[PDB]
Amino acid sequence: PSEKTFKQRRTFEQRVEDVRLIREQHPTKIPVIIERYKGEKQLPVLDKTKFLVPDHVNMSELIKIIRRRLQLNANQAFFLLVNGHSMVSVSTPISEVYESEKDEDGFLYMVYASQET
């Protein structure tokens, strides 16, 4: 097992350089880190945590992709918290979410949990 998050496993400079390369090789993708909330207990762990998401995909669509990857029941509660906090618009394309919520290192960080607060 690894206890470390992506940010704790890669230096700031390594992450900035990852984003630059992804930017040049995938100009219409947003680089997103999706991790399980640090003490989450109902939801399983995702197999992978690092994704490229097409600019046009909105949060509603991303949520349903991740839920399906987690093999969740339709009724199970799930929230995807961007840059620390519940997103109010779910129609917004992720390219625009990125503009308001991207980290200083250039990644977009999300955590998933069974509740919003």
Partner 1 sequence: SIVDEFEELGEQESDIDEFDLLEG
Measured from the CB atom, the residue of 46 and 65 that comes closer to partner 1 is 46
Measured from the CB atom, the residue of 48 and 68 that comes closer to partner 1 is 48
Of 105, 108, 113, 103, nearest to 93 by C-alpha is: 108
Determine if 2 is a binding residue for partner 1 (CB under 8 A): yes
Determine if 1 is a binding residue for partner 1 (CB under 8 A): yes
Helix (H) / strand (E) containing 21: helix 12-25
CA Rg, the chain, in Å?
14
Among 17, 22, 37, 49, binds partner 1 (CB under 8 A): 49
